[PDB]
Design a binder for this molecule. Structure first.
Ligand SMILES: Nc1ncnc2c1ncn2[C@@H]1O[C@H](COP(=O)(O)OC(=O)CCCC[C@@H]2SC[C@@H]3NC(=O)N[C@@H]32)[C@@H](O)[C@H]1O
Ligand SMILES: Nc1ncnc2c1ncn2[C@@H]1O[C@H](COP(=O)(O)OC(=O)CCCC[C@@H]2SC[C@@H]3NC(=O)N[C@@H]32)[C@@H](O)[C@H]1O
Lengths: 235, 234
């Protein structure tokens, strides 16, 4: 009854009034590529390192099952597909979303969405949490808070799915194309702190041909950051 | 993201851009009670006796998984829940649907919807097909044809699911209530032709406590139909 016209993402959609986590359900269940798992609310939503992700009613909490036929070295770019898709949807609604490497989308430096990719061989789960009409943690923001009015949740869903399908199809043909889109929508030219085994500060200059964040430390030393066990903090 | 407020029916909804049949999927897949299976289009839609149910884009083709812990003899009333739900939804959109025993809904005698209930040991599948904006077979009709304008398919889905959830919850407590709602919205007091071997004609008088169609033949004989097809124009 939804009338989706996408090629892969959205071929099937499983909706839940409530769920523990769409990412956990997607990883665990036997599902076809392109299947979207969406819930009004999550009781155990999570971010990276099982950090908690608040998922109250009013937001868009979903996961997409993918089985990308691309070299193993390109799978780390899947997170960017989600981030860019969210940015394009926000722009369609006249909201200036910007990417905080490598998985977050901010509006005026306030978190409005997050992307979590979990992979297991031939199966990749692309999870996306976007604040629309829901209440949010202090510091975060939402489409409703940004626009000053409630936003039809289903319209945002249709927008995002349409964007993701297109981005995904192009990624399968040209895995590198997504990097240019990230670059054009990412927060760069500012000082950031990288937190992992220890930490260092520098200017976030750009992302390289592998999607690694390039940081120039005050000494002039250049570091290439691989996302995985590190987080980014703005100064 | 649909924000359904129903208690049982619609707790989960599985949507397909295309499928063979929502009833078939529902029967062969383990699904919690209340799960709704819906598709934009079916390539092998089914009617009774495996008749074909045209299910092109624009209509509402769905199946609901049920597991009612009620007496065995009340299970034949599930089809009525689907029929009455459709009638209620049609009324909300200013359309007067009438039930043609035991599973069809007609508007001015043209078929607009059909119900197919299939029992399984593990569950009961309530299948409902309703013409909204799609092209229909000659002799049939749709909400769009009746209203003269495109009808928001999702609005119809929300309405129907809401009505069914309410009807089902009450059915679990007062299983006989559905019968009167059926009598109130069924085509009666007219001559009909019951089909199958031993075909016969007579006045469709009412339905009994088991949902059987009561027919009065011209001889005065009274027959009770458990299942079969009724023709209002022959
Ligand atoms: N609703 C919210 N809006 C903005 N920030 C939030 C938030 N909830 C939590 N946060 C903050 O974001 C931090 C984590 O951000 P990270 O970058 O580590 O982790 C993420 O940003 C990824 C979040 C992915 C959530 C989606 S919802 C659908 C799918 N199912 C899931 O269970 N997860 C995915 C938390 O520690 C909080 O500081
Ligand atoms: N789309 C349509 N609209 C009005 N009449 C139709 C129609 N398609 C077929 N018909 C006519 O109705 C007859 C069958 O009516 P019956 O009363 O026997 O059988 C029915 O009326 C029940 C139809 C149930 C269809 C739903 S769609 C979702 C679920 N999954 C399925 O595969 N099926 C269910 C066909 O033989 C045609 O004569």
């Amino acid at each position: 009854m939804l009338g989706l016209k996408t090629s892969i993402i959205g071929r099937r959609v499983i909706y839940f009034q409530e769920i523990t986590s769409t990412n956990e359900f997607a990883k665990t269940s036997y599902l076809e590529e392109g299947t979207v798992i969406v819930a009004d609310k999550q009781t155990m939503g999570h971010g990276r390192l099982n950090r908690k992700w608040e998922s109250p009613e009013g937001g868009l909490w979903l996961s997409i099952v993918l089985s990308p036929k691309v070299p193993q070295k390109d799978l780390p770019k899947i997170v960017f597909l989600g981030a860019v898709g969210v940015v394009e949807t926000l722009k369609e609604f006249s909201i200036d979303g910007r990417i905080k490497w490598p998985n977050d989308v901010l509006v005026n430096y306030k978190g409005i969405a997050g992307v979590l990719v979990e992979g297991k061989g031939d199966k990749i789960v692309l999870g996306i949490g976007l604040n629309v009409n829901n209440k949010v943690p202090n510091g975060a923001t939402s489409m409703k808070l940004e626009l000053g009015s409630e936003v039809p949740l289903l319209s945002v869903f249709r927008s995002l799915i349409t964007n993701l399908d297109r981005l995904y199809l192009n990624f399968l043909k040209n895995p590198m194309d997504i990097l240019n889109l990230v670059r054009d929508n990412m927060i760069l030219g500012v000082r950031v702190k990288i937190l992992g085994d220890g930490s260092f500060e520098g200017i976030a200059e750009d992302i390289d041909d592998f999607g690694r964040l390039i940081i120039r430390l005050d000494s002039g030393e250049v570091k290439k950051v691989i996302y995985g066990d590190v987080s980014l903090r703005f100064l």
